[PDB]
Amino acid sequence: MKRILVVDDEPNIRELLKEELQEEGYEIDTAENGEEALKKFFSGNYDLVILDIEMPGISGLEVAGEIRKKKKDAKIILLTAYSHYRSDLSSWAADEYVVKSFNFDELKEKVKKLL
């Protein structure tokens, strides 16, 4: 069994992502903000973290930087509604960048790839 930490500030989106990823057979934990994400991540044992960018408090780009620095071999996907941040220097902390779609096939392919 693989475990994924799903981080997004929007509760209905956390719910949707958790359902979609459970369907693929993963065990899913969630966090509602970056600060919570970092606490769960460093205290836990996740195979992959999926990180929203826009959140109240520290951004997912900031979270990605911290995880990359303190867990060199982490698997990190930025999953954001917005294509804006793709060219952002800070995105280089992530293994993949995915713009949220209502067709989850792309996200699932990238998750499968990283695991």
- List, as residue ranges, the binding site for Mg(2+): 9, 52, 54
Closest CA to 8 of 77, 69, 109, 75: 77
Q: How far is the CB of 95 from Mg ion (least distance, A)?
A: 20
Q: In terms of CB distance, is 4 or 63 closer to Mg ion?
A: 63
Choose between 25 and 85: whose C-beta lies nearer to ligand BEF: 85
Question: What are the distances in angstroms from CA 94 to CA 4, 25, 70?
Answer: 15, 23, 13
Binding of ligand BEF by 52 (CB under 6 A):
yes
Residues 6, 18 contacting (CB under 8 angstroms): yes
Task: Look at residue 81 and give the partner it binds from ligand BEF, Mg ion, none, a contact being a CB closer than 5 to 8 Å depending on partner kind.
Answer: ligand BEF
Q: How far is the C-alpha of 84 from the C-alpha of 96, rounded, in Å?
A: 15
Which amino acid belongs to residue 102? Answer: F
53 lies in the site for ligand BEF, by CB under 6 A: yes
Which positions lie near ligand BEF, rule CB under 6 A? 52-54, 80-82, 100
